[PDB]
């Protein structure tokens, strides 16, 4: 299947005292592999997956230098943005940045992205061609003109089409035992009688990876959304994910209903039915 490498950065200003809180995380697919937190003691980029621990000191030093540089740029940006938006020095504000690359099943470049937000709203983002920018408002439009004059998209494009892909492939190979493993959902259904006349069937999907999944209910072979509830996919904490979907049915008619589970780890979708 396809894969991605993505970095997420958050900086939150601290008007009362000191520097912004800065947190950076890096992911391959749904697996976190590095972190930086400006409040942690190490002041280093830190491994979060075993397969990254084999990189050598040259790697960690470079990632630490780069991540600190990113934090400094976000600190500057917080100041500049506070002035662009005519805001007080009293309030805390947030900059978020995400960038990375996707590869196809062939492990060749599919798409790149680089997006920036201020106070939780789009500010500026690279277009899919990696040559042009989308500015959300007139402040970001001044940024776009600056960045176009400085040819920043060309430098980012070189990273996103080239370096990013090369390193993603290295990590996929080095972390093969997990990163190339698909953990199909472990499924079951539970039954709960609300009254003598209606019952809730809950379809569980447990311990799966990657996080993408679809759970559908059908009645007599037709999709049913009324009388259903679907929770947001959630982390188990061990690197896998969980989800459930439930339907309310007339007691005695449970066997009409089927739960359909689609996931990359399943050669064909699973169908569950209460006749337990």
């Amino acid at each position: 299947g396809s894969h991605s490498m993505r970095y997420f950065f958050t900086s939150v200003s601290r008007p009362g005292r000191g520097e912004p809180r800065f947190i950076a995380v890096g992911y391959v697919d749904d697996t976190q592999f590095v972190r930086f937190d400006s409040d942690a003691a190490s002041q280093r980029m830190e491994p979060r997956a075993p397969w990254i621990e084999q990189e050598g000191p040259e790697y960690w030093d470079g990632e630490t230098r780069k991540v600190k540089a990113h934090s400094q740029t976000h600190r500057v940006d917080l100041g500049t943005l506070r002035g662009y938006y005519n805001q007080s020095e009293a309030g805390s504000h947030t900059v978020q940045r995400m960038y990375g690359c996707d590869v196809g099943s062939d492990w060749r470049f599919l798409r790149g992205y680089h997006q920036y937000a201020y106070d939780g709203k789009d500010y500026i983002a690279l277009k899919e061609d990696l040559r042009s920018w989308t500015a959300a408002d007139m402040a970001a439009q001044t940024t776009k003109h600056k960045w176009e004059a400085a040819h920043v998209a060309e430098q980012l494009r070189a990273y996103l089409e080239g370096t990013c892909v090369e390193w993603l492939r290295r990590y996929l190979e080095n972390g093969k035992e997990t990163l190339q493993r698909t953990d199909a959902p472990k499924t079951h259904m539970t039954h709960h009688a609300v009254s003598d006349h209606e019952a809730t069937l809950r379809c569980w999907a447990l311990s799966f990876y990657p996080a993408e999944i679809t759970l559908t209910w059908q009645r007599d072979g037709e999709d049913q959304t009324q009388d259903t509830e679907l929770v947001e996919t959630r982390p188990a904490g061990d690197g896998t994910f969980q989800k459930w979907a439930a339907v309310v049915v007339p007691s005695g008619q449970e066997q009409r209903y089927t739960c359909h589970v689609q996931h990359e780890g399943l050669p064909k979708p699973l169908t569950l039915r209460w006749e337990p």
Binding site: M5, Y7, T73
Partner: peptide
């Protein structure tokens, strides 16, 4: 592997 080493400011 992060981008860098330069990322211009806004």
């Amino acid at each position: 592997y992060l981008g860098g080493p330069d990322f211009p400011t806004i």
